[PDB]
Structure 1
Amino acid sequence: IVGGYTCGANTVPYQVSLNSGYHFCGGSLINSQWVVSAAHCYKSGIQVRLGEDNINVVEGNEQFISASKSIVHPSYNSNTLNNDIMLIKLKSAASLNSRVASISLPTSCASAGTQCLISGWGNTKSSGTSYPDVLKCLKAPILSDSSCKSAYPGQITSNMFCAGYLEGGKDSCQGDSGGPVVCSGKLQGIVSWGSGCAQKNKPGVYTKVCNYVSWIKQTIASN
């Protein structure tokens, strides 16, 4: 997260870190045994780390649970990032508590202007690189689809939405991928892609979770 702030320990209790020996993506706990992340976060050997604040220090609220199954969206296209969503089932149910909590799926879609919380352990610099140890947060509005498609001509699909600030300075970034965009208590977005980070007129692009609620629910129910 570039231009964000320190969330505060466990203030984003659905935020998970995907760990393959190191944090490589965020995700969101959607129930005790399921995380949603970006399909582009797919890899083998995922350990889901819940209750994390400082990802480099065991602070006492963590649960580390191995993925038992990853399910990349059937239509995920890695070239375009269309359908950049993946479900990860945990080998065992997370113990739910104030610091490890699921985030509600939308029952529809959010609108341009809705303020969302985007969070992650991604890069905090727009030029160069600095990785935070503690979870960073960003309040950002959903941008109109038109501004989104204007910022990224030919690349924005109906499964993507932009959020953030056309002026630059405030954005998600590498390392935030797969993590949540939560608007009005619902996971509306997954950190998906962008051009650089926090650059003028290059807002974050997020997987439009509301398009996937049927698939998420059906997939979870069947798995």
Structure 2
Amino acid sequence: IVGGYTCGANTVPYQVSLNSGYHFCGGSLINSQWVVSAAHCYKSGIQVRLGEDNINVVEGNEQFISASKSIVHPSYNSNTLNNDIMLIKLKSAASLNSRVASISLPTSCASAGTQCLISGWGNTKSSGTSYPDVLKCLKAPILSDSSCKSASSWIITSNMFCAGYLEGGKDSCQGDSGGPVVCSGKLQGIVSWGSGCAQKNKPGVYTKVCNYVSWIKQTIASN
């Protein structure tokens, strides 16, 4: 995360770290046995890590659970990243408590202008690289689709939304992929893509979760 702040140990209990010998993506615990992340974070042999703060030091609130099944969205398009979402099932249910809790799926979509909380262990520099060991937080508003398209001339699909600042300096970044975008206590988005990080007129694009609620609910009910 660029231009953010240190969240505070376990203050984002639903944030998860996907690990394959090292942290490579973020995720969100939606229930005792399922995690949601970005389809482009797909990889086999994923171990989900819950209750994390410093991903390099065992602090006492962690729970390491291997994934048993990964389900990429049926219409995921890696070239345009349309439908960049993925479901992961844990081998065993996690022990829920205050430091490890799930986040609710949204009942309705959030409007441009709303403030959201984005988090992750991603890179913290706009030019260069420096990875934090503890979780970083960032407050960012959802942008209107028209203003996003204008400043970036990108092709945003109805399954995406931009959030951040057109002035740059604050944004999600490499390693924050798959992470949660929480607005009004609900999971409204997933960190998907962008051009560089915190670039002026280059805000972050996020997967619009409200459009995949039926898909998510059906999938969990049969797997």
TM-score class, shorter: over 0.9
Shift of residue 6, structure 1, vs aligned partner: 0.3
Cα displacement string for residues 26-78 of structure 1 (whole angstroms, at most 9, x for unaligned residues): 00000010000000000001100000000000010000101100000001100
Q: Provide the secondary structure at the position in 1 that maps to 2:146.
A: helix
**Structure 1 residue ranges without an equivalent (≥5):** none
Aligned residues: 223
- Taking the aligned partners of 1:222 and 1:150, their CA distance within structure 2 comes to 42
Match of 2:17 in 1: 17
Cα displacement string for residues 175-205 of structure 1 (whole angstroms, at most 9, x for unaligned residues): 0000000000000000000000011110010
- Taking the aligned partners of 2:100 and 2:141, their CA distance within structure 1 comes to 25
Is residue 167 of structure 2 the alignment partner of residue 152 of structure 1? no
Shift of residue 154, structure 1, vs aligned partner: 4.3
- Taking the aligned partners of 2:147 and 2:37, their CA distance within structure 1 comes to 25
- Taking the aligned partners of 2:28 and 2:63, their CA distance within structure 1 comes to 14
Q: Provide the secondary structure at the position in 2 that maps to 1:64.
A: strand
- Taking the aligned partners of 2:201 and 2:94, their CA distance within structure 1 comes to 39
Shift of residue 148, structure 1, vs aligned partner: 1.9
**Structure 2 residue ranges without an equivalent (≥5):** none
- Taking the aligned partners of 1:60 and 1:148, their CA distance within structure 2 comes to 42
- Taking the aligned partners of 2:110 and 2:102, their CA distance within structure 1 comes to 19
Q: Provide the secondary structure at the position in 2 that maps to 1:147.
A: helix
Q: Provide the secondary structure at the position in 1 that maps to 2:150.
A: helix
Share of identical aligned residues, percent? 98
Cα displacement string for residues 12-36 of structure 1 (whole angstroms, at most 9, x for unaligned residues): 0000000000000000000010000
Task: Report the TM-score when normalising by structure 2.
Answer: 0.99
Matches within 5 A, 1:122-201: 122-201=122-201
Shift of residue 222, structure 1, vs aligned partner: 1.1
- Taking the aligned partners of 1:119 and 1:217, their CA distance within structure 2 comes to 24
- Taking the aligned partners of 1:194 and 1:178, their CA distance within structure 2 comes to 13
Task: Report the TM-score when normalising by structure 1.
Answer: 0.99
- Taking the aligned partners of 1:111 and 1:137, their CA distance within structure 2 comes to 21
Relative to structure 1, is the Cα distance of residues 154 and 124 closer, same or farther in structure 2, using a 3 angstrom cutoff? closer
Shift of residue 149, structure 1, vs aligned partner: 2.0
Which moved further from structure 2: 66-75 or 149-158?
A: 149-158
- Taking the aligned partners of 1:129 and 1:97, their CA distance within structure 2 comes to 34
- Taking the aligned partners of 1:211 and 1:12, their CA distance within structure 2 comes to 24
Shift of residue 153, structure 1, vs aligned partner: 2.6
Q: Provide the secondary structure at the position in 2 that maps to 1:67.
A: strand
Matches within 5 A, 1:1-150: 1-150=1-150
- Taking the aligned partners of 1:154 and 1:6, their CA distance within structure 2 comes to 31
Shift of residue 151, structure 1, vs aligned partner: 3.5
Which runs of at least 4 in structure 1 moved beyond 6 Å after TM superposition? Answer: none
- Taking the aligned partners of 2:145 and 2:207, their CA distance within structure 1 comes to 13
Cα displacement string for residues 96-116 of structure 1 (whole angstroms, at most 9, x for unaligned residues): 011110000101100001100
Q: Provide the secondary structure at the position in 1 that maps to 2:161.
A: strand
